[PDB]
Amino acid sequence: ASSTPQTNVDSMGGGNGQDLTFEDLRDIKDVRDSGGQVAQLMDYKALLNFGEGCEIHVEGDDETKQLVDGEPMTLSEW
Amino acid sequence: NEAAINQAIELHGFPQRHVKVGKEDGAPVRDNDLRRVRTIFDPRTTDANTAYFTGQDVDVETLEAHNFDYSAIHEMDMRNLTTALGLPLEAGNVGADGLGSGKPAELRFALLK
Numbered sequence: 001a002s003s004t005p006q007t008n009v010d011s012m013g014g015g016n017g018q019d020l021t022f023e024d025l026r027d028i029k030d031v032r033d034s035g036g037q038v039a040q041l042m043d044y045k046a047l048l049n050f051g052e053g054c055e056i057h058v059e060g061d062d063e064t065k066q067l068v069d070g071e072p073m074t075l076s077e078w
Numbered sequence: 079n080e081a082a083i084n085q086a087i088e089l090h091g092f093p094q095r096h097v098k099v100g101k102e103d104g105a106p107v108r109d110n111d112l113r114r115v116r117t118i119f120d121p122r123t124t125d126a127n128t129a130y131f132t133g134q135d136v137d138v139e140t141l142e143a144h145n146f147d148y149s150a151i152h153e154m155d156m157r158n159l160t161t162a163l164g165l166p167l168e169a170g171n172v173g174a175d176g177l178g179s180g181k182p183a184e185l186r187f188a189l190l191k
C-alpha cells in the first residue's frame with residue numbers, strides 16, 4: 001500500500017556524489033593492474049563466475065516468431 | 079633469487095680445505111712459509127687416496143658444506159613465477175601434496191581450461 005516507498009534508505013548526503021572518490025576507484029585499478037598473486041586470484045574469481053559462457057532463453061519463444069529482415073526470427077534468434 | 083642460489087651453491091654447497099700452520103701462541107708463519115705448505119696440500123694435484131704425515135703443529139681443518147634449503151627456495155620462486163604468469167605449479171617441474179588429487183586437482187585444471 002505504497003507507490004513511493006515509505007521507508008528511508010540511509011543516504012550519506014553529508015559526505016557531492018558518493019563516499020567513493022575517484023582516487024578510491026583508481027586504487028581498485030592499481031590493485032588490478034599490479035599483476036602478481038592477488039590480481040591472479042581475483043581473475044580466477046571472474047573466470048569461475050563468468051568464464052564458462054552463457055545461453056539466452058525466452059519462455060514461449062516459438063510464439064514470438066515474426067518476419068524481421070523479411071524472414072522469420074523468434075526473439076531468441078533476434 | 080636464481081642467481082643468488084647459484085652463487086650460494088658455488089661458495090657453500092661444497093666443503094673446502096683449511097690448513098692451519100704453526101703452534102697456537104707459538105712462532106709466527108709468514109706468506110713464503112705458507113707457499114711451501116700450499117705446495118704440499120694443493121687440491122689441484124692431490125688425489126682421493128693421498129695420505130699426510132706431519133708434526134703436531136699442522137692442522138687440516140675443513141669448511142663443511144653449510145646446509146641450506148635451496149630446493150625450498152626454488153619451489154617458492156617457481157610457485158611465485160608460475161602463479162604470477164597464471165600457469166599451474168606443475169608447469170614449472172614443481173608439485174604440491176594433496177593438490178595432485180580429487181576436487182583440489184579438478185579445481186586448478188578447471189581454472190586453467
Ligand SMILES: [Mg+2]
Binds near residue numbers: 104105106
Ligand atoms: Mg717469537
